[PDB]
Design an enzyme around this catalytic site. Sequence first.
Site, PDB file in Angstrom:
ATOM      1  N   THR A 159       0.784  -1.194  -0.123  1.00  0.00           N
ATOM      2  CA  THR A 159      -0.059   0.063  -0.053  1.00  0.00           C
ATOM      3  C   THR A 159       0.706   1.330   0.024  1.00  0.00           C
ATOM      4  O   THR A 159       0.735   2.206  -0.839  1.00  0.00           O
ATOM      5  CB  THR A 159      -0.888   0.136   1.147  1.00  0.00           C
ATOM      6  OG1 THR A 159      -1.784  -1.263   0.834  1.00  0.00           O
ATOM      7  CG2 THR A 159      -1.713   1.228   1.089  1.00  0.00           C
ATOM      8  N   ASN A 180       5.598  -1.679   3.670  1.00  0.00           N
ATOM      9  CA  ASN A 180       4.508  -1.318   4.467  1.00  0.00           C
ATOM     10  C   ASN A 180       5.267  -1.131   5.810  1.00  0.00           C
ATOM     11  O   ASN A 180       4.777  -0.548   6.891  1.00  0.00           O
ATOM     12  CB  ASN A 180       3.578  -2.237   4.593  1.00  0.00           C
ATOM     13  CG  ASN A 180       2.497  -1.776   3.632  1.00  0.00           C
ATOM     14  OD1 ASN A 180       2.515  -0.500   3.001  1.00  0.00           O
ATOM     15  ND2 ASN A 180       1.518  -2.543   3.356  1.00  0.00           N
ATOM     16  N   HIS A 265      -8.460  -9.298   2.448  1.00  0.00           N
ATOM     17  CA  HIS A 265      -7.252  -9.871   3.323  1.00  0.00           C
ATOM     18  C   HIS A 265      -7.979 -10.982   4.018  1.00  0.00           C
ATOM     19  O   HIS A 265      -7.564 -12.124   4.195  1.00  0.00           O
ATOM     20  CB  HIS A 265      -6.770  -8.951   4.326  1.00  0.00           C
ATOM     21  CG  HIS A 265      -5.663  -8.406   3.728  1.00  0.00           C
ATOM     22  ND1 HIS A 265      -4.509  -8.724   3.320  1.00  0.00           N
ATOM     23  CD2 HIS A 265      -5.314  -6.927   3.586  1.00  0.00           C
ATOM     24  CE1 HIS A 265      -3.554  -7.780   3.163  1.00  0.00           C
ATOM     25  NE2 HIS A 265      -4.142  -6.637   3.014  1.00  0.00           N
ATOM     26  N   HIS A 420      -1.052  -9.275  -0.704  1.00  0.00           N
ATOM     27  CA  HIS A 420      -0.311  -8.716  -1.695  1.00  0.00           C
ATOM     28  C   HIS A 420       1.204  -8.376  -1.464  1.00  0.00           C
ATOM     29  O   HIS A 420       1.291  -8.563  -0.108  1.00  0.00           O
ATOM     30  CB  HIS A 420      -1.268  -7.870  -2.211  1.00  0.00           C
ATOM     31  CG  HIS A 420      -1.505  -6.706  -1.109  1.00  0.00           C
ATOM     32  ND1 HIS A 420      -0.747  -5.713  -0.615  1.00  0.00           N
ATOM     33  CD2 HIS A 420      -2.467  -6.618  -0.131  1.00  0.00           C
ATOM     34  CE1 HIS A 420      -1.132  -5.200   0.045  1.00  0.00           C
ATOM     35  NE2 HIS A 420      -2.116  -5.534   0.529  1.00  0.00           N
ATOM     36  N   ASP A 683      26.692  -1.496 -13.831  1.00  0.00           N
ATOM     37  CA  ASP A 683      25.831  -0.970 -12.630  1.00  0.00           C
ATOM     38  C   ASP A 683      26.342  -1.511 -11.543  1.00  0.00           C
ATOM     39  O   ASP A 683      25.447  -2.096 -10.706  1.00  0.00           O
ATOM     40  CB  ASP A 683      24.377  -1.066 -12.894  1.00  0.00           C
ATOM     41  CG  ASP A 683      23.560  -0.305 -12.094  1.00  0.00           C
ATOM     42  OD1 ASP A 683      24.172   0.729 -11.500  1.00  0.00           O
ATOM     43  OD2 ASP A 683      22.423  -0.410 -11.866  1.00  0.00           O
ATOM     44  N   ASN A 685      27.175   0.137  -8.667  1.00  0.00           N
ATOM     45  CA  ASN A 685      26.548   0.738  -7.576  1.00  0.00           C
ATOM     46  C   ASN A 685      25.119   0.653  -7.435  1.00  0.00           C
ATOM     47  O   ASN A 685      24.401   1.059  -6.588  1.00  0.00           O
ATOM     48  CB  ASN A 685      27.016   2.142  -7.518  1.00  0.00           C
ATOM     49  CG  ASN A 685      26.501   3.014  -8.366  1.00  0.00           C
ATOM     50  OD1 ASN A 685      25.881   2.476  -9.439  1.00  0.00           O
ATOM     51  ND2 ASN A 685      26.649   4.354  -8.475  1.00  0.00           N
TER      52      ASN A 685
HETATM   53  C1  XTB Z   1      -3.760   4.494   4.222  1.00  0.00           C
HETATM   54  N1  XTB Z   1      -4.034   6.023   4.098  1.00  0.00           N
HETATM   55  C2  XTB Z   1      -4.333   6.586   2.716  1.00  0.00           C
HETATM   56  C3  XTB Z   1      -3.152   7.182   1.983  1.00  0.00           C
HETATM   57  C4  XTB Z   1      -3.318   7.996   0.932  1.00  0.00           C
HETATM   58  C5  XTB Z   1      -2.591   8.919   0.296  1.00  0.00           C
HETATM   59  C6  XTB Z   1      -1.071   8.321   0.372  1.00  0.00           C
HETATM   60  C7  XTB Z   1      -0.123   8.725  -0.450  1.00  0.00           C
HETATM   61  N2  XTB Z   1       0.823   9.380  -1.267  1.00  0.00           N
HETATM   62  C8  XTB Z   1      -0.697   7.286   1.329  1.00  0.00           C
HETATM   63 CL1  XTB Z   1       1.053   6.861   1.439  1.00  0.00          CL
HETATM   64  C9  XTB Z   1      -1.696   6.767   2.300  1.00  0.00           C
HETATM   65  C10 XTB Z   1      -3.690   7.129   4.778  1.00  0.00           C
HETATM   66  O1  XTB Z   1      -4.006   8.232   4.631  1.00  0.00           O
HETATM   67  C11 XTB Z   1      -3.313   6.556   6.204  1.00  0.00           C
HETATM   68  N3  XTB Z   1      -2.797   7.839   7.176  1.00  0.00           N
HETATM   69  C12 XTB Z   1      -3.647   8.228   8.247  1.00  0.00           C
HETATM   70  N4  XTB Z   1      -3.185   9.267   8.732  1.00  0.00           N
HETATM   71  C13 XTB Z   1      -1.978   9.784   8.484  1.00  0.00           C
HETATM   72  C14 XTB Z   1      -1.728  10.857   9.399  1.00  0.00           C
HETATM   73  C15 XTB Z   1      -0.539  11.423   9.029  1.00  0.00           C
HETATM   74  C16 XTB Z   1       0.552  11.184   8.101  1.00  0.00           C
HETATM   75  C17 XTB Z   1       1.557  11.917   7.362  1.00  0.00           C
HETATM   76  C18 XTB Z   1       2.771  11.320   6.621  1.00  0.00           C
HETATM   77  C19 XTB Z   1       3.919  12.443   6.178  1.00  0.00           C
HETATM   78  N5  XTB Z   1       3.026  13.619   5.813  1.00  0.00           N
HETATM   79  C20 XTB Z   1       3.411  14.220   4.408  1.00  0.00           C
HETATM   80  O2  XTB Z   1       3.190  15.450   4.126  1.00  0.00           O
HETATM   81  C21 XTB Z   1       4.502  13.510   3.475  1.00  0.00           C
HETATM   82  C22 XTB Z   1       5.597  14.201   3.692  1.00  0.00           C
HETATM   83  C23 XTB Z   1       5.552  14.290   2.485  1.00  0.00           C
HETATM   84  O3  XTB Z   1       4.447  14.135   2.402  1.00  0.00           O
HETATM   85  C24 XTB Z   1       2.073  14.431   6.675  1.00  0.00           C
HETATM   86  C25 XTB Z   1       0.925  13.427   7.002  1.00  0.00           C
HETATM   87  C26 XTB Z   1       0.062  10.109   7.265  1.00  0.00           C
HETATM   88  C27 XTB Z   1      -1.225   9.529   7.736  1.00  0.00           C
HETATM   89  C28 XTB Z   1      -1.533   8.221   6.693  1.00  0.00           C
HETATM   90  O4  XTB Z   1      -0.958   7.636   6.055  1.00  0.00           O
HETATM   91 CA    CA Z   2      -3.252  -1.272  -0.405  1.00  0.00          CA
HETATM   92 CA    CA Z   3      25.193   2.946 -11.532  1.00  0.00          CA
HETATM   93 CL    CL Z   4       6.921  -4.587   3.672  1.00  0.00          CL
HETATM   94 ZN    ZN Z   5      -3.566  -4.873   2.169  1.00  0.00          ZN
END
Ligand code: XTB
Ligand code: CA
Ligand code: CA
Ligand code: CL
Ligand code: ZN
Length: 805
Positions: A159, A180, A265, A420, A683, A685
Amino acid sequence: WTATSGSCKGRCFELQEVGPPDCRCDNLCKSYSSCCHDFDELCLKTARGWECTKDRCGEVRNEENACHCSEDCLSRGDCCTNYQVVCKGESHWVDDDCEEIKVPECPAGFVRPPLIIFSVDGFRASYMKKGSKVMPNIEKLRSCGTHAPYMRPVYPTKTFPNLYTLATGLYPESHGIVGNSMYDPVFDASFHLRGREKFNHRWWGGQPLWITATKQGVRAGTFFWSVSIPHERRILTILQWLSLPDNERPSVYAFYSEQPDFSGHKYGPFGPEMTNPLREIDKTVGQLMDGLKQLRLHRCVNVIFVGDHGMEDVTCDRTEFLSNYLTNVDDITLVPGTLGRIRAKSINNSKYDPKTIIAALTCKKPDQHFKPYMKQHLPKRLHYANNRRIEDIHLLVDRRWHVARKPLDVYKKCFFQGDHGFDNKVNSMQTVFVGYGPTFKYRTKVPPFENIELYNVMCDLLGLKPAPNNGTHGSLNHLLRTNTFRPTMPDEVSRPNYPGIMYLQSEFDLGCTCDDKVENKLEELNKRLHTKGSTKERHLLYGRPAVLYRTSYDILYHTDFESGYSEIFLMPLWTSYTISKQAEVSSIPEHLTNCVRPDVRVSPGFSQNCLAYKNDKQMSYGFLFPPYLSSSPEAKYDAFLVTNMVPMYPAFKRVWAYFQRVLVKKYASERNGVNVISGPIFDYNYDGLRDTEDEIKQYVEGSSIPVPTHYYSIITSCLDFTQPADKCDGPLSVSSFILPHRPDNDESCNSSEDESKWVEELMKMHTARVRDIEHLTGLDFYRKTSRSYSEILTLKTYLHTYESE
Ligand SMILES: CN(Cc1ccc(C#N)c(Cl)c1)C(=O)Cn1cnc2ccc(C3CCN(C(=O)[C@@H]4CCO4)CC3)cc2c1=O
Ligand SMILES: [Ca+2]
Ligand SMILES: [Ca+2]
Ligand SMILES: [Cl-]
Ligand SMILES: [Zn+2]
Ligand SMILES: *[C@@H]1O[C@H](CO)[C@@H](O[C@@H]2O[C@H](CO)[C@@H](O[C@@H]3O[C@H](CO[C@H]4O[C@H](CO)[C@@H](O)[C@H](O[C@H]5O[C@H](CO)[C@@H](O)[C@H](O)[C@@H]5O[C@H]5O[C@H](CO)[C@@H](O)[C@H](O)[C@@H]5O)[C@@H]4O)[C@@H](O)[C@H](O[C@H]4O[C@H](CO)[C@@H](O)[C@H](O)[C@@H]4O[C@H]4O[C@H](CO)[C@@H](O)[C@H](O)[C@@H]4O)[C@@H]3O)[C@H](O)[C@H]2NC(C)=O)[C@H](O)[C@H]1NC(C)=O
Ligand SMILES: [K+]
Ligand code: NA
């Protein structure tokens, strides 16, 4: 510390997050436990549910309600999404015919069509067909817009790595979200889906779309969502933001769903329990489209419906245990599951041996459902090595399986039926893409493509200049009606030399021998024509590759092949040759077995030498143009030129000789001729990028002959195979590989058998895109064709996957 005693009054789902210790009211405050005391009361209203009913029509506004059916709701932007349907005799968006959106049809004050990204977790590609009867809104998006049969995720097919790839256009090795969960050895910290560590920005590299947008003056909605905000409230929030004043309103929005992954899942990908989560996602799409249509934005917004990965059947009883292979299982840490990553339990332990761990995992049981790799040996197409968070030891796990350290890890936490994470070529891991809106094409199917390409397209959709990324900008222009992007070929940096005959035989002291002295002006002018490029249009069908860095190289013409020979690396950078359907395979004659011939066009000082190979007991040599495919006994002498020679481990020569002697001719018979471009890759590195000479870690003993880490071939033919490769009027068809140049065949468990039982399987595993080879070589291919450049860019991103239908 939060002084949570501030208020969300007038601030519900505010777009600028405020700094501690003032309390927050944005869509992430729940994740941080930092919401103001009255967030639930003010911002998460639920009273009377999510739908207008006939008796609520024109009701007196009650601010407690989740959404509104009062007369004033449209101007306030907070109607229930079905308000117009129930209370004004309007039709649901899904019930309307589809009509081409030729131009954006936007309200006054809209500067540009907004982009809404609707991300669905675990949405496997075949749900589009298999769940079609229960997903009418999604099916309408799909048939009316632009769609691919599937979209390829990145590895690992987890994810966080995939969503953040969608957002940045970068491989996980470059953006840093490499799993993850991951442990960073420099942070001495673990990132997990659970917990606060994931909140620290230091994990998250690259430049995601929202930052690209903000930097360029385009306002962005929040892409992350707190899990406890229900779906209906996420949609209403997006719709309310869309009713903001022009100067305050974002131009890009993101909805995310945890489904169908969450149920997948528990129930497996096609469990009877999966029909409902698909119905529920479809209903949510229906809310969004009805809400857009209410706001007269349904022919203005571009909508992208995209998944992060698929889902495969995986159960507790299909778990391989490392304790079954190793004796020392407590000296390791394993990141388990649908991939394995192994590191030492302690940096303080100097008696931990990666070499002996690998050997103890290699080909140890005949049914073995995983394969260990040093990360630099993983297929190059996975781009899964150049990050300190990726452990040196990697286990590629068979689809449908898990790896775990010890049985106690599985029973002390059967729970699950789906999972997955497997190789991104696996059919069950493929996911979905639909684009619908004025900027996308109407009723158009596009070939499958990789999710790393989408960032460039979303930037194009928003008029933004993309940050540097791993997409090939232009390769997805065929998705778009307008806003394309006009790609242009990179400029050649080094022009070749074209050397004539400049050296006498006796100037060479290469320790080479050939049995070649057997003595006609008919066939002497003929041989000269070939050395000057007479047959070049036969063997170089798409122009010479451009060299995109500063170097010294020569073009060498021959009857049967052309090459670009590097005076710096002392071997060709590329060798190009065409093999028609009718070509014959011949043997290397006995008298020519060890023949290597000086090339009188190239100086002794820029040539390899046979003595080095004699003295290097590990290292042998092979040829880039195969002597087996010589057009005549006389042309065969050209194949033994020292300028056609490359260093090869004997173990690798088994692979290479089978490819050249058997497989090329097979492909030429199946494809009606092929053109082949082959060459070395360096390659050391493991960054996916061409090494400079000072990066080479291995040479042929006592020489300046560098040893390739890999050998590539790009094999091109006519897509319409009724036309021969060498006279094709239309689109092309390509398959390519990047084979690791290894001193053993430990990767292939059946290598003791005949090459016909294992070589082709290996080559398939190391299938590659033309673009991967371009990064690894600093060459640019297909410079002269009759095809559009956008089409050539799509061809260069093609991956032949060898998965069934
Ligand atoms: C599953 N999910 C859907 C989803 C939707 C979009 C993406 C993406 N892309 C991901 Cl991985 C996942 C969620 O949102 C779950 N979830 C819930 N609450 C959170 C609260 C804070 C943060 C942070 C992470 C770092 N921050 C950035 O600004 C990065 C630093 C630069 O950006 C600030 C916000 C992350 C989450 C979070 O991941
Ligand atoms: Ca996923
Ligand atoms: Ca290289
Ligand atoms: Cl992993
Ligand atoms: Zn999953
Ligand atoms: C896929 O697309 C991406 C994006 O285009 C390609 O990645 C780029 O590749 C470039 C070449 O490898 C690389 O450019 C280098 O950047 C150095 C500056 O780095 C910082 O700044 C940028 C820009 O804002 C930033 O994005 C970088 O982010 C990385 O690092 C942080 C962690 O600190 C992470 O949060 C982030 O995820 C990212 O990590 C990834 O990249 C690094 C490498 O930067 C890897 O180590 C990680 O594992 C991970 O993959 C940085 O914050 C700059 O210092 C370099 O300059 C050196 O080389 C040139 C040669 O021209 C020379 O002139 C200079 O002198 C200099 O040498 C000096 O430094 C040496 C190294 O320390 C030293 O040994 C010397 O002796 C000298 O003192 C260089 O320009 C660029 O950063 C990345 N970008 C990204 C986002 O990864 C990628 O190649 C593509 N993949 C394929 C297969 O095509
Ligand atoms: K040798
Ligand atoms: Na083997």
